[PDB]
Curated annotation (Swiss-Prot):
This is Lysine-specific demethylase 3B. Leu-Xaa-Xaa-Leu-Leu (LXXLL) motifs are known to mediate the association with nuclear receptors. Fe cation binds at residues 183, 185, 312. It is linked to Diets-Jongmans syndrome: An autosomal dominant disorder characterized by varying degrees of intellectual disability, developmental delay, short stature, and characteristic facial features such as a wide mouth, a pointed chin, long ears and a low columella. Residues 121-340 form the JmjC domain. The lineage of its organism: Eukaryota, Metazoa, Chordata, Craniata, Vertebrata. It is found in: Nucleus. Ubiquitous. Highly expressed in placenta, skeletal muscle, kidney, heart and liver. Histone demethylase that specifically demethylates 'Lys-9' of histone H3, thereby playing a central role in histone code. Demethylation of Lys residue generates formaldehyde and succinate. May have tumor suppressor activity. Its gene is located in the 5q region of the genome which is deleted in del(5q) interstitial deletion, a frequent deletion found in myeloid leukemias and myelodysplasias, suggesting that it may be a good candidate for the del(5q) tumor suppressor gene. Belongs to the JHDM2 histone demethylase family. The chain holds residues 1380 to 1717 of 1761 of the full protein.
Length: 340
């Protein structure tokens, strides 16, 4: 039977089933006011799937100049063609190699650049914006989005959306690394998985993906989405309540000191965007500071709602294309106020 919703993270995470259901707000707003993230599945079935393929991005935009990051060591690969990234998205033997001769795990940095998404890709922009869930919250001019309505006493988000493109992490050592490191945003955001690329050549890399999800602390119902429904998993997220950010800063100041970093006692390890919380650090956060998070596996077509001020990190299981839009809900506008 079709149902309006279900629960993940043992009842702590709302999962809405129909992205275009006009009654979603009634269930959504109760969870959202308490500072929880929310998941909405099925957004891929609303989109024009031909507009979101890596081969199309390569063919249409391949000649533009970009920087990449090596996700294993944070090295920057300067001033290469965007086709050098896209043509290795799923075919492993086409990927740029490190000195060791291994194919690199790469992230495409700031592409499209700044606020240029709408100008460069007007048809993609239309397809996405017209199919975002909770549109009174997420559309540029929706009635519950205060972005366009606030004075300069509030930090206003840039014009979006922003695209996030990166390969999947592969090895046991890769389990300890992030695609995007732990950080927080002063605005709310919705992040949609529009494409998951399962590669070929080293195409049989299914079992380390399971160990990563398991060690990632994913719930039993989330593991049933793979084994029972054969949905494509993109990325493993950890999200923490805005109210726990200072306890996370205290853990990361202590670990920094243990590892011989030499940091003033007030510096901000979350703003630095330099940490990924691996299994050891997440267990220590829980045991020593009493802080619990949400471990979320974002499948193809899943939209993750991230509350303003909530620390979060992203670990790609396979190659992913994500598109995110910022918004300012009245529930969380305190997070972007420039005084007290
Ligand atoms: C110190 S901070 O965490 O960077 N911060 C203060 C601010 N004025 O932006 C806000 C960040 C969003 C959540 C509420 C706090
Ligand atoms: Cl809050
Ligand atoms: Cl376009
Ligand atoms: Cl809505
Ligand atoms: Cl990062
Ligand atoms: Mn973010």
């Amino acid at each position: 039977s079709m149902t309006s919703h279900s629960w993940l993270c043992d009842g702590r995470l709302l999962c809405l089933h129909d992205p275009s259901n006009k009654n979603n707000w009634k269930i959504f707003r109760e969870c959202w006011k308490q500072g929880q993230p929310v998941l909405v599945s099925g957004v891929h079935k609303k989109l024009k799937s031909e507009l979101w393929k890596p081969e199309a991005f390569s063919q249409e935009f391949g000649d533009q100049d970009v920087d990449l990051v090596n996700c294993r060591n944070c090295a920057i690969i300067s001033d290469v063609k965007v086709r050098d990234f896209w043509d290795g998205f799923e075919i492993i033997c086409k990927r740029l190699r490190s000195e060791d001769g291994q194919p690199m795990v790469l992230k495409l940095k700031d592409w499209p650049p700044g606020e240029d998404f709408r100008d460069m890709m007007p048809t993609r922009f239309e397809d996405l914006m017209e199919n975002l869930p909770l549109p009174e919250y997420t559309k540029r001019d929706g009635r519950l989005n205060l972005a366009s309505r606030l004075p300069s006493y509030f930090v206003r988000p840039d014009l979006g959306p922003k695209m996030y493109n990166a390969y999947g992490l592969i090895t046991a050592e890769d389990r300890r690394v992030g695609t995007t490191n732990l950080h927080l945003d002063v605005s709310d955001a919705v992040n949609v998985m529009v494409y998951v690329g399962i590669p070929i050549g080293e195409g049989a890399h299914d079992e380390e993906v399971l160990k990563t999800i398991d060690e990632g602390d994913a719930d039993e119902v989330t593991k049933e989405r793979i084994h029972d429904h054969k949905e494509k998993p993109g990325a493993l997220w950890h999200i923490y309540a805005a109210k726990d950010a200072e306890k996370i800063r205290e853990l990361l100041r202590k670990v920094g000191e243990e590892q011989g970093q030499e940091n003033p006692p007030d510096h901000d390890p979350i703003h630095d965007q330099s940490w990924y919380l691996d299994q050891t650090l997440r267990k220590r956060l829980y045991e020593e500071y009493g802080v619990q998070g949400w471990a979320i596996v974002q499948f193809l077509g899943d939209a993750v709602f991230i509350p303003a001020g909530a620390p979060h990190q992203v670990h790609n299981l396979y190659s992913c294309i994500k598109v995110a839009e910022d918004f300012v809900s009245p529930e969380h506008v305190k997070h972007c106020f420039r005084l007290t």
